[PDB]
Paper text:
In this study, we identified that PH1991 is a tRNA:m5C72 MTase NSun6 (PhNSun6). PhNSun6, with 12 α-helices and 19 β-strands, is divided into two distinct domains with different sizes: the MTase domain, including an RRM motif (residues 34–79 and residues 173–185) and a Rossmann-fold catalytic core (residues 185–389), and the PUA domain (residues 86–164). The tRNA substrates recognized by PhNSun6 were based on (i) the 3′ CCA terminus, (ii) the target site C72, (iii) U73 or G73, and (iv) the discriminatory base pair C2:G71 at the acceptor stem.
A non-conserved extension motif (residues 1–34) was observed at the N-terminus. When comparing the structures of PhNSun6 in the apo form and in the form bound with cofactors, the overall structures do not show distinct changes, except that helix α9 moves a slightly toward the cofactors. Third, PhNSun6 lacks the eukaryotic specific Lys-rich loop. Taken together, the structural differences between PhNSun6 and hNSun6 might contribute to the distinct tRNA substrate recognition mechanisms.
Residue numbers in the entry: 5 to 388
The structure:
């Protein structure tokens, strides 16, 4: 599994966590989340009512003892060994389609990069990503020709994916806005912010609106949430999400959030889900980003951070989060905040790990907490 991570990044991980831990993390990083979490949209439905609806579709949702709005599904797999060499003709899927097949999705024609020319409909085939990673096994629903020519349609019925997560996008319960797929550490982030109806609240990296709509339902559609993102297209999707979830709490604004104080607004609560190297996202088939990206991105984040701090009222609260594992983007950029009049506060919910040489921040590790790599920092602005 180590091959999914560039050499210098592996050393970085060995240096930051210790060889043994780093090897457990990278191993789990290649696999999907063991517990797949969704958020109960309490604006429309209670948790137990939703559970009833999900069980109707043959789904087995489990309750979270920590998050009353939390449900999760248990991941199936692996369904074959890491060294399994199926005696099958090969279908090569592109990068993105291979990742979804890896988690149980069918393989559709536009996801087909190339294939063995002996494949006819009904043939058992193995699916590999462009680098040879075995991600699934199934039955061809197209001949070779149609498979490499169609623009739509089922190409390979995946009957044995490497891993299985429930597909929830196609459910009535989703279309009715009863839930929103969201990770446990992401949900913790929104709780730890502790939004109040009176609070002036800014989500400066809001799209696609996961945490934004979370805050919404926590406020019970009261008050106002300002939600910012770079492109309107990302906001277009978010408007759809907001509509579906029956959220009436959010004001969308399109802008470079690094220029946030250009608004005449001093906020009480600010959530910065900062753009990051995403080193912690799962599943991680091949890690493309590396050390040069960590440094550059860590520097890139500081402009958001500094913008946030200047837009905060005295005694205001900032929640800083990333889905990355690096020190520079996390503990390092919090030390930057501490030098700029921000104080570390205890978080209302702490079920993860402590930080690296750092006490009140919260981390999530895939091997320990069955989640994505995640970082949560809650700060209080004591002075300018």
């Amino acid at each position: 599994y180590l091959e999914a991570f560039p050499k210098e990044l592996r050393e970085y991980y060995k240096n930051l966590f210790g060889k043994e831990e780093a090897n457990k993390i990278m191993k789990k990083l290649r696999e999907p989340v063991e517990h797949y979490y969704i958020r109960v949209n309490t604006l429309k439905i209670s948790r137990e009512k939703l559970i009833g609806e999900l069980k109707k579709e043959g789904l087995k949702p489990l309750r979270s003892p920590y998050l009353p709005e939390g449900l999760y599904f248990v991941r199936e797999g692996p369904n074959f060994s890491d060294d399994f060499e199926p005696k099958l003709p090969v279908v090569v899927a592109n990068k993105y389609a291979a990742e979804s097949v890896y988690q149980g999705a069918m393989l559709y024609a536009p996801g087909v990069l190339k294939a063995d020319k002996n494949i006819k409909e009904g043939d058992e085939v193995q699916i590999r990503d462009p680098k040879g990673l075995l991600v699934g096994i199934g039955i061809a629903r197209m001949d070779y020709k149609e498979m490499t020519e169609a623009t739509r349609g089922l190409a390979v019925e995946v009957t044995l994916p490497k891993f299985k997560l429930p597909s929830l996008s196609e459910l009535k319960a989703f279309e009715k806005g009863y839930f929103y797929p969201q990770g446990l550490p992401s949900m913790v982030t929104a709780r730890v912010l502790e939004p109040k109806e009176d609070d002036v609240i800014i989500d400066m990296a809001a799209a696609p609106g996961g945490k934004t709509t979370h805050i919404a339902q926590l406020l019970e559609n009261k008050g106002e949430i300002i939600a910012i993102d770079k492109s309107k297209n990302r906001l277009r999707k978010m408007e759809e999400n907001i509509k579906r979830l029956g959220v009436k709490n959010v004001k969308l604004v399109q802008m470079d959030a690094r220029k946030l104080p250009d608004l005449g607004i001093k906020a009480d609560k600010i959530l910065l889900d900062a753009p990051c190297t995403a080193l912690g996202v799962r599943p991680k088939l091949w890690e493309e980003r590396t050390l040069k990206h960590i440094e550059a991105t860590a520097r890139y984040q500081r402009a958001f951070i500094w913008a946030a701090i200047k837009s905060l009222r005295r005694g205001g609260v900032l929640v800083y989060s990333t889905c990355t594992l690096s020190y520079e983007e996390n503990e390092g950029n919090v030390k930057f905040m501490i030098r700029k009049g921000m104080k570390l506060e205890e978080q209302s919910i702490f079920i993860g790990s402590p930080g690296i040489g750092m006490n009140k921040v919260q981390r999530f590790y895939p091997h320990k907490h069955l989640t994505q790599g995640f970082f949560i920092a809650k700060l209080r602005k004591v002075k300018d």
